Amino acid sequence: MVVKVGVIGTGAMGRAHIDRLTNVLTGAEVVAVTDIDHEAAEAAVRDFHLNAKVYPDDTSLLQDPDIDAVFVVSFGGAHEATVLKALDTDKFIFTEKPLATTLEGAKRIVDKELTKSKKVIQVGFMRRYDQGIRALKEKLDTGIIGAPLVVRASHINPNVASNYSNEMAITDTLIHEIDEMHWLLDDEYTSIQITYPRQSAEVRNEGLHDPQLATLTTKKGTVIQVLVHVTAQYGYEVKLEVIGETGELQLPNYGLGPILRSNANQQTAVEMSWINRFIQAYNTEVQEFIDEVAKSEPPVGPSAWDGYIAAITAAAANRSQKDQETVLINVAGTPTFYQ
Amino acid sequence: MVVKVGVIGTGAMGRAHIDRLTNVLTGAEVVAVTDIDHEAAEAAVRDFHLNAKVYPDDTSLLQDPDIDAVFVVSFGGAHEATVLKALDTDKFIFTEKPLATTLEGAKRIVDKELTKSKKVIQVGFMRRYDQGIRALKEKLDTGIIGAPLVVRASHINPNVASNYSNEMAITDTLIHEIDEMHWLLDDEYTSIQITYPRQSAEVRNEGLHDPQLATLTTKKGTVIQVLVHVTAQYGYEVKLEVIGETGELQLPNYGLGPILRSNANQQTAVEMSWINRFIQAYNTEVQEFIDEVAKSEPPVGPSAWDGYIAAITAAAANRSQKDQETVLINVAGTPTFYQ
Amino acid sequence: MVVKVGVIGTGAMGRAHIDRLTNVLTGAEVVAVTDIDHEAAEAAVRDFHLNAKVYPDDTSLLQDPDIDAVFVVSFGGAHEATVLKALDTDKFIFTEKPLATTLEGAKRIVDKELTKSKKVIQVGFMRRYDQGIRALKEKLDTGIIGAPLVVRASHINPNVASNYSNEMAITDTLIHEIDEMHWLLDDEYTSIQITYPRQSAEVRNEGLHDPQLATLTTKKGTVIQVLVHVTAQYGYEVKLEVIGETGELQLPNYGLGPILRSNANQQTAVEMSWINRFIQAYNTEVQEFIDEVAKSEPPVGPSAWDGYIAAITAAAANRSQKDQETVLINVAGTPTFYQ
Amino acid sequence: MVVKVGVIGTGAMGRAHIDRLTNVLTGAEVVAVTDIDHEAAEAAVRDFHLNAKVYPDDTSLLQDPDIDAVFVVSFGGAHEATVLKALDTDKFIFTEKPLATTLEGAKRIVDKELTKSKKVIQVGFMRRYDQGIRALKEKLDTGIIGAPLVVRASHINPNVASNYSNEMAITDTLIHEIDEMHWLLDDEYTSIQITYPRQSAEVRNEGLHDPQLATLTTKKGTVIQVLVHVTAQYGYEVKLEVIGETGELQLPNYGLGPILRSNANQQTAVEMSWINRFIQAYNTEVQEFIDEVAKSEPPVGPSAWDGYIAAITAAAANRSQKDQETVLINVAGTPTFYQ
Ligand SMILES: NC(=O)c1ccc[n+]([C@@H]2O[C@H](COP(=O)([O-])OP(=O)(O)OC[C@H]3O[C@@H](n4cnc5c(N)ncnc54)[C@H](O)[C@@H]3O)[C@@H](O)[C@H]2O)c1
Ligand SMILES: NC(=O)c1ccc[n+]([C@@H]2O[C@H](COP(=O)([O-])OP(=O)(O)OC[C@H]3O[C@@H](n4cnc5c(N)ncnc54)[C@H](O)[C@@H]3O)[C@@H](O)[C@H]2O)c1
Ligand SMILES: NC(=O)c1ccc[n+]([C@@H]2O[C@H](COP(=O)([O-])OP(=O)(O)OC[C@H]3O[C@@H](n4cnc5c(N)ncnc54)[C@H](O)[C@@H]3O)[C@@H](O)[C@H]2O)c1
Ligand SMILES: NC(=O)c1ccc[n+]([C@@H]2O[C@H](COP(=O)([O-])OP(=O)(O)OC[C@H]3O[C@@H](n4cnc5c(N)ncnc54)[C@H](O)[C@@H]3O)[C@@H](O)[C@H]2O)c1
C-alpha cells in the first residue's frame, strides 16, 4: 500500500522532494501541500501533476487523517514549530535539516518526541546515505586500520550566492560534517574550534570569512580537521580521510565522466553542483524513510537526537566564530528511545 | 498504471531484475514466475516477498491474460523459443541478451515480430544506458579528439559457470561489445576476426578457449580490438579507450569503495560481478521499458533488430573461432518497422 | 680508474652521450671524437670543455691505444661498418640502435663478434633500463599474475618531422617495443603482422600510414598488440599492460608534476618529449656500460644478439607493411657466447 | 677539477654520503675521514675502497690543507662545534641537518659566517631538491591557483627505534616540513602549535606522543596543517596539498611501480623506506654542492640562515609540545649576505 505524504514548504528542496516522491522513488504519493506562499503551493501541484489538496497552513494539513507522513521543507527557522505541531498527530515526520535553528528549539522537539510511544522523526542528513561515505565507514568498522586517530576532511564549493553569511558556513555547509563525523566514528564530540586562515580575495559577501578551518575533538581523543572553502572556484568536492593506527582510508576519486588526453594534459571533469553530487544520497535517504512508513515501523535514519547533537555543535561553532576560541561540547548520553 | 510482469528464468539475473522491479523501480509488480528448476522459481517468490503465481513452464505463464509484460531471463540458448511463443500473445517482451544464440534464431524472431502491428521486444543491451559509457560517447561526439581511429576494449570476468561454452565467449560476452561499438561509433562492421592467445591454466570448462581476442573493423575504417578474458580471477571489469586523431578518451576506473593504505600497499576494491557494476544501467533500461508498457507504446530501447544485427556479427565470430580467420560482415538496412 | 671514451658521431644523441659521460655520470672521460662533419666534432670538444683529440674518421680514432671504449652514435646506416672496424680492436663498443640497418649487417656483426674471446658490444635499447618498465617486469617475474597471456602496449608520439617515412614507424618507433617484449616475456617471436586502421587526417608525410597496429606472437603463445600512433597530437606516451592468468600489471602514468584542480577539471601534464621521458633510462644504461668497462668485464645490457633479433623482427615488420599480411619469424637458438 | 672532501662522522648517513660521492655522483673524491669510533672510520675507508687518511678527530682533519670541503655528518648535537671550527679554515662546509641543536648555536654560526669573505655553508635540507616538490612549487608560483590560503601535509613513517623520543618528532621528522614550507610559500612564520590527538596503541616508546598535529601560520596568513605520524605501519609517505583561492595543487602518489590487478583489488606499492623515497633529492643536493665548490663559488642550497630559521621554529615547536599552546615566532630579517 502507498504512503500518502503531505509536503510543508514547496520551494527548491520541497519541489525536489516532491519530484523524488512522484517521479523517482517507489511507494509514495504526495496528496497535500502547503506553503506560506500560496502560489508556490499551487505551482507544485500543477507542475508535478499532483492529485493533491492545497492547504492554507501546516495546522490544517496536519489534521488530514489520510496523510501518513509529512515532509517539512520550509525555511530552517520554521521547522521547530511545525515539527512540534506534527508531534500532536500520529504522523511520521521527515524534516530537512536543521531540526531547529536553536539548540533550545531542538531540545523542545526531543522532549515532546520522547513522550510518544514510538519514534516518528527522521532528519535530512543525507551524507550518511552516500555510497562512498557509507562504504568508507563500513571498512573502518572492520578494524583493518585500527582505531581512528585523526580525520581530515574538506568541504569545497565553487561560489556562494549573495545571501550567504559567515554563520551559514556552519549551518548550511559544515553542518553535514557535524552530523557525519560522530556517526562515522561512533563517538561523541567534546569541543569545536573555528579558525580563519587568510581571507580569500574571492569573497564578495559582507562578513563572510572563507576559508574556515574547523577542529573537533571526540571523547576517545580523535581529532577532526575540516577545511570549509566555499569560494574555491574550481568545483564542488567532498574529501574524507581517516588516519588509523595501522593504515588510512580515504574516499576515492568521484566521477563517471571520461579521462581526456588532449593538448599536453590528462584530465577529468569535476562536479560543479552539490545537487548532482548527492542525488543518489537523497534518493536513498527518502526511499528508506518511505519504506519504513510503509511497514508502520519507526525510521532508522538520522533522528531528532542527531538533529539535537548537530544543533548543539553548530551553536558551539557559531560561538567559536566570534573569537576563534575552542568551545566545549558536552552532549547528554543518548536516551535509549534513540538507540 | 502498474505493469504486471511475469519473469521466465529466476537465476542470478532473473532475481536481480525481480529485486529491482519490486524494491527500486516504479510502476511494476512481479505477479508470475517460472523456471525449469521449480525450486528456484519458488525461492524467488519467497526471497523477494512476492504475491506471484509459479507456473510450471513458459507456455502456461504466457497464457495468463493478466500479465502485461514478460522478462526472458533464462539461459541464452533458451531465449529464442520463449520469445517466439511470447510473440503469439499481445504482451510486451524484455529479453536479456543475446536475442538468440544463432543468426537463424535471431532472424526467426525478427521475421515473426515484423508480422505484428506494433513492436513489442526490447533486448537488454544495457551498456548503452551506462552513465559512464554515455558520457564518453557524448565527449567523443563533440569532436574534441577528432575522428575515432582505434578502439581498445576489455571485457573481464573472474570466472564462469560450468555451462559456459566456447561459443558463449561470443554470444554471452562479446555480444555486449558487438552491440556497444556500433552504437558508440554510429558505424557498422565490415569484418570480425577471433584469435586465441596462450590458453589460460585457469580454464575449467571443456572446449573453452580463454582469453580470446576479437578484432572488428568498421565501414569508416575504425579498428576495434577487444580482449575477452572470462577466467581472469581478479575481478569483473569493463575497460574502453577511444584513440582519436588529436586525443584519447578512456572510461575511468569504477568504484565507490575506499582507498586503503595498509601493509605496504595502496588499494581499492574491484567489483566481482556485473550485478553491481551495471546496476544503474539495468535500472535505467528496465524503468524505460516499464514506462513504455504503462503507455501501451512500443519500447524505445534496443530492439530485436539490434539483436539480429548483433547476431550476424556474433555468428561471424563463432565462424572465425573455428580457424581464426577473418569473416566478412555486411548487414541489411533497417526495416521501416524498426526505425 | 677513469674509462677513456671516444665518440663516433657528434650529432644530437652523440652530444647527449658526451654530456652524460662528462657532466652527469661517473667514471669516464671523453678523450676523442670524430664526425664526418669535422666542424661538429670540434664544436663538441669546445662545448663540453673536453681534453680530447679530433680525428678525421673512425679508423684513426680506433688506432688510439688509450681509448678503452667507443660510442657509435652516427646515422643508423653507418653503424654496421663502424662496429665491424671497432671489432678489429680490443675496445668495448656501445652502439646506439639499430645494431645495423639490415638483418644481414646485424649477422655480420654477430659472426665477427663470436670470433672474439669476450663479448664487447652493448646496443642502446634503453627501454630495459627504464625504472617503470623494469619494475613491471620484476613484478611479473614474481609469478603474482601467473603466466602472461596477452600484452597490450602503446607507443604514442605527438608529431613527426618531414623525413619520417612509413618504414620508420617500425625502425625508429616500434623498434623499442620489438627489443622490449621478448626480454619482458623471456620468450622468442614467431610472427609479426602490421595492420592499418583508418588513416589519420593529421598525417602530413608522403607514404606514412598512421596509426599502425602491430601484432606479435611468441613461442609460448603470448599475443602482443602494440598501437603505434605518431601524429597523436596530445603528448608522448609509453603504455604497457600485461594480462596474466590470475591478474594484470600496467605501467602507471609517467610524471612527477602536480595534480591541478582548476576550472572544473582535475588534471596532470603529459610529457611532450621522448627525450625527457627517457632521461633516466639513458643515464642508467650508460652508467652500467661504463661500470662494466671499468672492471674489464663484458657488458651485460642488450647485446649484438639482441640487435640481431631486433633487425630480423624489424625486417619482417617492414615486409608486413607492404600488404598487411602476417610474416613468420624464426630466430636461431642463442649461441652460448650470448647466454 | 676534482673536489677533495673530508667526512666527519662515518655512521649511516656519513657512509651514505661517502657512497654518493665515490660511486654515484661526479667530481668529488673522499680523501679524509674521522669518527669518534675510530673503527667505524677505518671500516668506511675499507668498505668504500677509499684512498683516504683516517684522522682521530675533527680538529686534525680540518688541518689537512688538501681538503676542499668537509661534510659534517656526526650526531646533531656535534654539528655546531664542528661547523664553528671549520669556519676558521677556508674550506666549504656541507652539514647535515640540523645546523645546530639550539637557536643560539645556530646564531653563533650565522654570526661567524657573516665575518667571512664568502658564504661557505650548505645545510642538508634535501626536500627542496625533490623533483615532485619542486614541480609543485613551480606550478604554484605561476599564479594558476591564486594565493595560497591553506597547506595540508603529512609526514608518515612506519615505525621508530627504541631511542626515538617525543622531541624527535620535531627535531628529526617535522624539521623537514619546517624548512620546506617557508621556502615553498616564500613567506615567514609567525607561530607554531603542536597538538596531540589520540595516542596510538602502536607506540612502544615512553613519553612519545604519536601522532602529532602541527599548525604553523605565516605572515601573509597562510595556515599550514601537518600530520606527523611515525608509527603509521603501512609505509613511508610524504603528502602535500596547497589550497589556493581559485584551485588546488597536490603531489601525486610517489612511485614508479606497476598497478596490480589481483585478488579483488587494484593496488600500487607504498615505499617502506625514507632512504629510497628521497634518494633523488640527496643525490641532487650533494651534486649541486660539489658543482659549486668545483667553481669556488658559494653554495646555492639551504644556508646557515635557513638553518637558523629551522632551529628557531623547532625550538618553538618543542616549547609548544609541553602544554600544546601556540608559540609565537618572529625571525629577524634576512641579511643581505644570505639573499
Ligand atoms: N539536506 C540538504 O542538503 C538540504 C538541501 C537544500 C535545502 N535543505 C533545507 O530545506 C529547507 C528548504 O530550503 P529550500 O532551499 O527549499 O528553501 P526555499 O526558500 O526555496 O523554500 C522554502 C519554501 O518554504 C516556504 N515556507 C517558508 N516558511 C514556511 C512555513 N512556515 N510554512 C510553510 N511554508 C513555508 C517558503 O515560502 C518557500 O516556498 C531548508 O531547511 C534547507 O535548509 C536541505
Ligand atoms: N545484460 C547483462 O549484463 C546480463 C548479466 C547477467 C546475465 N545476463 C543474461 O541473463 C540470462 C540469465 O543468466 P543468469 O546469469 O541469470 O544465469 P543463471 O544460470 O543464474 O540463471 C538462468 C536460469 O534460467 C533457467 N532456465 C534455463 N532454461 C530455461 C527455460 N527454457 N525456461 C525457463 N527457465 C530456464 C535456469 O534454470 C536458471 O534458473 C542469460 O541470457 C545471461 O546472458 C545478462
Ligand atoms: N636509443 C635511442 O632511443 C636513440 C635515440 C636517439 C638516437 N638514437 C640513435 O643515435 C644515432 C644518431 O642519431 P642522432 O639523433 O644523434 O642523429 P644526428 O643526425 O643528430 O647525429 C648523427 C651524427 O652522425 C654524424 N655521422 C654520420 N655518419 C657518420 C660516420 N660515418 N662517422 C661519423 N659520424 C657520422 C653526423 O654528421 C651527425 O653529426 C642513430 O642511430 C639513432 O637511431 C637512438
Ligand atoms: N637530512 C636528512 O634527511 C638526514 C637523514 C639522516 C640523518 N641526518 C643527519 O645526519 C647526522 C647523522 O645521522 P646518522 O643517522 O648517520 O647517525 P649515526 O648514528 O648512524 O652516525 C653518527 C656517527 O657520528 C659519529 N660521531 C658522533 N659524534 C661525533 C663527533 N663528535 N665527531 C665525529 N663523529 C661523531 C658516531 O660515532 C656515528 O658513527 C645527524 O645530524 C642526522 O640528523 C639527516
Ligand SMILES: O[C@H]1[C@H](O)[C@H](O)[C@@H](O)[C@H](O)[C@H]1O
Ligand atoms: O560475460 C558475462 C557479461 O559480463 C555479463 O554482462 C552478461 O552478459 C553475462 O553474465 C556474461 O556471461
